[PDB]
Design a protein around this ligand. Structure first.
Ligand SMILES: O=C(c1ccc(C(=O)N2CCC(N3CCCC3)CC2)c(Nc2ccccc2)c1)N1CCC(N2CCCC2)CC1
Ligand SMILES: O=C(c1ccc(C(=O)N2CCC(N3CCCC3)CC2)c(Nc2ccccc2)c1)N1CCC(N2CCCC2)CC1
Lengths: 309, 306
């Protein structure tokens, strides 16, 4: 047995006001309709340009553990039931996307209608998944932070777009560095931002001009258009204040949601500290992550919460 | 309070025998000569083609926590005092290697002798560092450790002693990795055709109808001789056996671990008292896995089962 009200009194602290959490982080207004064994399509979190054949492996509160059919369960991952990068069976085909078939299946030999029959499986219904016009369009070029090497701002392209969300690709870099985002992302910048902020812009591998890079030459050579400066929107500040409490998914063992504290604040990030555990477990995370939640999110959703160690 | 002896009688299991461990995993012959502040050169574990200016941030047991000078403490990493990818000050200049200087330092403006006199620091004494058929330029077929389904066209781009650096042609260098002649991840040219596997050709190469012969002449390189690739005998680690394993998630800690599952060259470590979702695979010749008593013998704290 463990209550937040008693804990906030004992510690003499305040929770991050619920009003500071966005719709995808806040209390769901509905129940989790997903059931184990339901099939769907979805983005690979490690290879974000790839759509894979997924199966609901576990249902816990408002979250689902997704399994990559035919692949090892060591690759299994957690998402909320309202996640944006999960889609119903037939979505890739209807929206013009390439779907990676299960392991040992060739694209040219994969059919959903026949696969669900073979598996004696049911597709996750379309309703379990049930836009402000942005300036971004597929093919558009900008400057973006390589989230894996954050000291690098590179030449990038919008290579995919789903509703108001788009996939950032780094030209002539492999696709494992790709990531999804939106107009207000603090990681994306318009062409010329780097020169303006006295920053080095990392140029495409194999591109002869490294130190003498011209955006206008590159845009002619690639027959591309730049993302308009006006398509980029201001990210309002989160407002989360140091020492404030919340609920955070453990990056390490994501099956758990733990009692967290805002250890330190950034302009768009927060430093999660898991109460009881040592300061070495602390890490940075975006304050608009669907993996950070308000106090009682676990209690309300039916998700077990890990009290302080 | 905790002991391995009482734990072995209570849980009714026998430990991974001392003999089954390699020289870099077993009980060391000497004490830890390193001290906090000592400066050195060493390979970046996440960019294995890069040599960096390091400082002994922390000394604990037969281990050292190393700091990348000028860069965040968030990149600090742990190695054993007898690690092979750490070198004394001046080694890169001696061996014609490229040393990456501290943050904000240009290669053209860095000098150890002056840098040490600026940080009022001492170099790690050379004495602390006194611990193959492959040659630099040789081509082989290697497994991409980050994406193991992939076997690709690779070159040996560096060689230090009997250890060499595997680089994937026309892929970024963050995929590079150091290994030895007995590694299961490396194979001779033609092993994929021979084993009815797909060989990942270099990005930008026209074919993927790929030819190793056209490519070897184009690049003007030699393929590693099939004889240089040496056989690795199996570890002999039976399931339920006990040992000490460095936690990958928080490597400042070494914990009580069981051999949950076994492979030909790998073992599935299970941290006792923890959920099976913490369990991970690891090479059996890893210097992060040690025999029962290694922490107590070296002065490193051991983590009991949770
Ligand atoms: O990043 C990759 C990579 C790795 C893997 C897949 C892949 O086979 N996928 C199917 C299986 C899936 N999940 C399901 C279960 C968990 C893994 C990942 C996507 C992949 N495919 C792909 C094809 C087309 C377009 C873009 C990507 C590309 N490489 C750069 C790094 C490369 N290596 C660098 C060193 C040598 C090669 C290897 C390829
Ligand atoms: O792999 C890299 C990479 C990343 C970083 C460094 C780097 O700045 N280094 C200095 C600092 C050090 N440590 C010290 C503290 C921890 C980090 C690593 C080496 C680097 N340099 C380098 C130059 C020459 C030769 C080989 C490497 C290349 N990229 C492919 C992936 C790239 N991104 C892909 C998407 C867009 C860009 C970015 C660059």
């Amino acid at each position: 047995a463990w209550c937040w009200a008693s804990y906030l009194e004992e510690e003499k602290a305040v929770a991050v006001p619920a009003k500071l959490f966005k719709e995808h982080q806040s209390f769901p207004y509905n129940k989790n309709g997903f059931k184990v064994g339901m099939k769907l399509e979805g983005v690979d979190p490690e290879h974000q340009s790839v759509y894979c054949v997924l199966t609901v492996a576990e249902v816990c509160g408002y979250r689902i553990k997704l399994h990559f059919d035919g692949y090892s369960d060591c690759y299994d991952f957690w998402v909320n039931a309202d996640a944006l990068d999960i889609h119903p069976v037939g979505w890739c085909e209807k929206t013009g996307h390439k779907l990676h078939p299960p392991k040992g299946y060739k694209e040219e030999e994969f059919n959903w209608q026949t696969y669900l029959k073979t598996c004696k499986a049911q597709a996750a219904p379309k309703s379990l998944f049930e836009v402000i016009p942005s300036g971004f369009r597929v093919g558009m070029k900008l400057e973006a932070v390589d989230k894996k090497n954050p000291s690098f701002i590179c030449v990038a392209t919008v290579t995919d777009m789903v509703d108001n969300r788009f996939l950032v690709h780094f030209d002539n870099w492999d696709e494992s560095y790709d990531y999804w985002c939106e107009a207000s992302s603090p990681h994306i910048h318009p062409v010329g931002w780097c020169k303006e902020h006295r920053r080095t812009l990392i140029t495409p591998p194999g591109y002869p001009n490294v130190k003498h890079f011209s955006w206008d030459k590159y845009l002619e050579e690639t027959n591309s258009l730049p993302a308009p400066a006006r398509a980029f929107k201001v990210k309002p500040p989160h407002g989360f204040q140091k020492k404030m409490k919340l609920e955070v998914v453990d990056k390490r063992n994501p099956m758990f949601i733990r009692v967290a504290t805002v250890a330190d604040t950034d302009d768009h990030r927060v430093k999660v500290h898991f109460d009881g555990w040592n300061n070495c477990y602390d890490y940075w995370i975006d304050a608009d992550s669907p993996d950070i939640h308000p106090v009682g999110w676990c209690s309300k959703t039916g998700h077990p919460l890990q009290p302080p160690l």
